[PDB]
Write a protein that binds this ligand. Structure first.
Ligand SMILES: *[C@@H]1O[C@H](CO)[C@@H](O[C@@H]2O[C@H](CO)[C@@H](O[C@@H]3O[C@H](CO)[C@@H](O)[C@H](O)[C@@H]3O)[C@H](O)[C@H]2NC(C)=O)[C@H](O)[C@H]1NC(C)=O
Ligand SMILES: *[C@@H]1O[C@H](CO)[C@@H](O[C@@H]2O[C@H](CO)[C@@H](O[C@@H]3O[C@H](CO)[C@@H](O)[C@H](O)[C@@H]3O)[C@H](O)[C@H]2NC(C)=O)[C@H](O)[C@H]1NC(C)=O
Ligand SMILES: *[C@@H]1O[C@H](CO)[C@@H](O[C@@H]2O[C@H](CO)[C@@H](O)[C@H](O)[C@H]2NC(C)=O)[C@H](O)[C@H]1NC(C)=O
Ligand SMILES: *[C@@H]1O[C@H](CO)[C@@H](O)[C@H](O)[C@H]1NC(C)=O
Ligand SMILES: *[C@@H]1O[C@H](CO)[C@@H](O)[C@H](O)[C@H]1NC(C)=O
Ligand SMILES: *[C@@H]1O[C@H](CO)[C@@H](O)[C@H](O)[C@H]1NC(C)=O
Ligand SMILES: *[C@@H]1O[C@H](CO)[C@@H](O)[C@H](O)[C@H]1NC(C)=O
Lengths: 201, 596
């Protein structure tokens, strides 16, 4: 071969604005050469916690149609993003399958997504009728009935708004400051593989 | 669906939105107390009036759930706090009258002024001055005059206000399913959940004197020794048969006897252990003091202190026009934010206060995982006891020598040990009868056993009997002596201070027992002991989620409140006092008085 073709990880990691967890952003990646070495050696990333694939052998494997899902969550909830985990956002906002083969990266963003008056532009789902299937996205905004009476879309007794905002502040302690999370999913279907790392000469 | 599910959903909705508003109110209060400007006053007012104006609706909504069907205990316990009427049981007129009464009582107490007879234009206040006069002076006549002036130019107008206050608050309590206001105060010490750990409101009454009767001989011997020393003091005033007067104790009310230490030092020649000069000689700043205080807790085993505490907290010396009231406080602003506030100086008392406040911060940090409504101590007495344990354990000569303050080749002996024990006793054990008598009087007057006419006289003979304090000058019915107190004019419960000492000494004795220490209890130290730290943490992490009877089961092996550790701590002092005053007799006679 000769000089390679880069893959655009800049527009997914260094984006100015992310999206709330209840509407987590999804991106598809195909026909590119991905270099995970620069991601592994980076010191900024706090959590690099990926199970089914050994971290040192990403460049050797060759996949097709990689996926990247990005969002912003609280510090204490980063442990909820794992196979076979339960909580509030794990079962109501973003659920991972139990046979996951991916890789989750999480890092601190206190100086980007915080404001002295408070950043109230991040919302998450709190009430659902039932749990969520893996890799399912729900954006329905309808009043929630916790009793045995119709609500008619007005916040009465036992009728709650399903989505609730975040209260990020610059002086909050660790565990409440916003964290940015991105998960990579490696699927391998029957079509020829295209996405895998450089072949050194 | 079941009611419990609706209650759970309501609580989940409530707590998350309450957290942010509470945090905003706390931040406004911090900004005001750290930077006293006019703007901050109204900012705090307008950022905190909303918190109650939000809590009111949440309290209102938490009544359609019939709290006799909920199970799971924790949900019911959490909902119990929300289902509180407060003061809404009464109409607007009575409520506003009560609020105005509280405000005018506080204003009258906080603006006291008494002028000496010869100059009716230059008065003195309860701020240093009159307090300084009755604290560190020598004349009998001026002390008596100051006592009478303070009790006749402050508490004389408080009598009608308190008389109306008693009946108004009693009516409110009766409206709130409590026949007395004493029950309303005692409701904190009540649990009606798990079997075998239950506790009723009326049981505390029977418990208080049951645990008080065992310490009577120690108080009697201390009273006899202090009276003998005061007889070596001011002549032709004390009687070797009766009990000592009121204004010679060394304070406005006699709550503490610390100011009396100078007159009644056992040896005198032996100097107390003070390392202020040594601390200065090594160039010790506030940062060093707080780092040593943190290292103590780290060595014990408690969690390491978080970043931002070293940045946001105002540790020392505001200095310039940036004024700030700096009563030493520990702030838990919520959302994982903890701070301290103090005007640190280079002195031993600052070291002890730093240890105390750091222990407060540690306890606040321990139970952060509990829900919003359960982030407190098991009862009102645990918090200060936990804070004071570290202060007690950080003043030992061994610990001071280990941090390189005292000389390495220092040796302690009988005299200095007895001196320190007496100094600590004069502050710790000399206040229990006063608190017991005051709380008993308040409960009795709330219940209504003593009528309107039998208010002051009954107060005075119960003070003469329980405490041993006589009349300098009589008061018939026109005064209200107990009303001239901070915790009585501001509507504060007073039985906390009685339980705090017993809890702290039980905790210290248990830790020393499970710390492998040999010798007298007063020289015990819990540094470099991970098992003691683990045992303490296993109870601190509980929060309010469990009854305090269960809380007093992981530190000690008995749920009841016993008083043996106190009698164990002051054992050398007691055995010295037994052979010290072998001629004078213990006890007092209630008939003799200074004026009759
Ligand atoms: C997203 O943005 C970050 C920075 O905001 C990018 O990381 C930075 O990339 C630059 C350019 O390669 C690095 O500078 C280089 O550093 C090496 C080692 O010191 C030096 O020899 C080179 O001459 C050059 O100066 C920089 O170190 C690196 N890290 C930081 C903290 O700035 C990142 O590449 C962007 N894209 C992604 C996907 O993260
Ligand atoms: C709690 O345990 C720590 C150690 O885990 C104790 O600190 C150690 O104290 C000893 C003396 O008590 C120190 O030994 C001396 O060190 C100096 C140099 O600093 C040396 O010149 C002397 O000849 C002697 O060897 C030791 O260094 C010190 N270690 C540390 C890490 O501070 C501490 O005293 C214990 N506290 C108690 C028992 O209250
Ligand atoms: C009361 O209900 C709560 C649920 O809100 C229970 O709390 C959970 O209990 C289980 C088992 O004890 C634990 O595994 C969970 O970690 C607890 N928390 C949550 C959020 O599920 C509680 O145990 C119940 N108590 C009783 C006595 O039934
Ligand atoms: C205290 O408040 C005043 C009034 O706005 C302000 O000018 C000053 O900077 C504040 N102090 C600090 C330390 O910020
Ligand atoms: C509060 O007062 C109302 C009457 O205004 C009463 O119906 C309600 O039961 C009270 N709350 C409780 C917990 O008793
Ligand atoms: C505790 O925090 C201090 C502060 O810097 C640090 O020096 C020390 O190593 C910490 N100890 C731990 C994490 O065990
Ligand atoms: C303290 O008292 C004991 C008891 O007899 C005695 O043996 C010891 O010498 C005394 N110590 C001093 C310093 O007086």
């Amino acid at each position: 071969p000769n000089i390679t073709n880069l893959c655009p990880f800049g527009e997914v990691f260094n984006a100015t604005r992310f999206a709330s967890v209840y509407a987590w952003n999804r991106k598809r990646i195909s026909n590119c050469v991905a270099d995970y070495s620069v991601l592994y050696n980076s010191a900024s990333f706090s959590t690099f916690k990926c199970y089914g694939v050994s971290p040192t052998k990403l460049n050797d494997l060759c996949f097709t149609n990689v996926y990247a899902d990005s969002f912003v969550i609280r510090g204490d909830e980063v442990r909820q993003i794992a196979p076979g985990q339960t909580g509030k956002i794990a079962d109501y906002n973003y659920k991972l399958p139990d046979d996951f083969t991916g890789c989750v990266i999480a890092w601190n963003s206190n100086n980007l997504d915080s404001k002295v008056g408070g950043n109230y532009n991040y919302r998450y789902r709190l009430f659902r009728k039932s749990n969520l299937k893996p890799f399912e996205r729900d954006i329905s905004t309808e009043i929630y009935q916790a009793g045995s009476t119709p609500c008619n879309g007005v916040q009465g007794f036992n009728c709650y708004f399903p989505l609730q905002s975040y209260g990020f502040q610059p002086t909050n302690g660790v565990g409440y400051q916003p964290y940015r999370v991105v998960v990579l999913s490696f699927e391998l279907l029957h079509a020829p593989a295209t996405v895998c790392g450089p072949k050194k000469s | 669906s079941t009611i419990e599910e609706q209650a759970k959903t309501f609580l989940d909705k409530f707590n998350h939105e309450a957290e942010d508003l509470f945090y905003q109110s706390s931040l406004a209060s911090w900004n005001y107390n750290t930077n006293i400007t006019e703007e901050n006053v109204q900012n705090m007012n307008n950022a905190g009036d909303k918190w109650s104006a939000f809590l009111k609706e949440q309290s209102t909504l938490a009544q359609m759930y019939p709290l006799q069907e909920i199970q799971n205990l924790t949900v019911k316990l959490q909902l119990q706090a929300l289902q509180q009427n407060g003061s809404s049981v009464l109409s607007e007129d009575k409520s506003k009258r009560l609020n105005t009464i509280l405000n005018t009582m506080s204003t009258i107490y906080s603006t006291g002024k008494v002028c000496n007879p010869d100059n009716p234009q230059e008065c003195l206040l309860l701020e240093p001055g009159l307090n300084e006069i009755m604290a560190n002076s020598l004349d009998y006549n001026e002390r008596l005059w100051a006592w009478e002036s303070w009790r006749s130019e402050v508490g004389k107008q408080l009598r009608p206000l308190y008389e109306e206050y008693v009946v108004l608050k009693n009516e409110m309590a009766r409206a709130n399913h409590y026949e007395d206001y004493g029950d309303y105060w005692r409701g904190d010490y009540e649990v009606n959940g798990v079997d075998g750990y239950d506790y009723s409101r009326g049981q505390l009454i029977e418990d208080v004197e049951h645990t008080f009767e065992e310490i009577k001989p120690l108080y009697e011997h201390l009273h006899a020794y202090v009276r003998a020393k005061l007889m070596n003091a001011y002549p032709s005033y004390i009687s070797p048969i009766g009990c000592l007067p009121a204004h010679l104790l060394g304070d406005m009310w006699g709550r503490f006897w610390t100011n009396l230490y100078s007159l009644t030092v056992p040896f005198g020649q032996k100097p107390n252990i003070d390392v202020t000069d040594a601390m200065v000689d090594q160039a010790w700043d506030a940062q060093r003091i707080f780092k040593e205080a943190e290292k103590f807790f780290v060595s014990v085993g408690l969690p390491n202190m978080t970043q931002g505490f070293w940045e946001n907290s105002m540790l020392t010396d505001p200095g310039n026009v940036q004024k700030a009231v700096c009563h030493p406080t520990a702030w838990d602003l919520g959302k994982g934010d903890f701070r301290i506030l103090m005007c640190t100086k280079v002195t031993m008392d600052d070291f002890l206060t730093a240890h105390h406040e750091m222990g407060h911060i540690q306890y606040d940090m321990a139970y952060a995982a509990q829900p919003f409504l359960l982030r407190n101590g098991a009862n009102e007495g645990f918090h200060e006891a936990v804070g004071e344990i570290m202060s007690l354990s950080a003043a030992t000569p061994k610990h001071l020598k280990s941090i390189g303050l005292l000389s390495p080749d220092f040796q302690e002996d009988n005299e200095t040990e007895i001196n320190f024990l007496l100094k600590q006793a004069l502050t710790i054990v000399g206040t229990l009868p006063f608190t017991y008598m005051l709380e008993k009087w308040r409960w009795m007057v709330f219940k209504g056993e003593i009528p309107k006419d039998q208010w002051m006289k009954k107060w005075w003979e119960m003070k003469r009997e329980i405490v041993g304090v006589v009349e300098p000058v009589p008061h018939d019915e026109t005064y209200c002596d107990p009303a001239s107190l901070f915790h009585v004019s501001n509507d504060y419960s007073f039985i906390r201070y009685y339980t705090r000492t017993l809890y702290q000494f039980q905790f210290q004795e248990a830790l020393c027992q499970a710390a492998k220490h040999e010798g007298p209890l007063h020289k015990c130290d819990i540094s470099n002991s991970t098992e003691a730290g683990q045992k303490l943490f296993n109870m601190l992490r509980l929060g309010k989620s469990e009854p305090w009877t269960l809380a007093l089961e992981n530190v000690v092996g008995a749920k009841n409140m016993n008083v043996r550790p106190l009698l164990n701590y002051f054992e050398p002092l007691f055995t010295w006092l037994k052979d010290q005053n072998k001629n004078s007799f213990v006890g007092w006679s209630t008939d003799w008085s200074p004026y009759a």
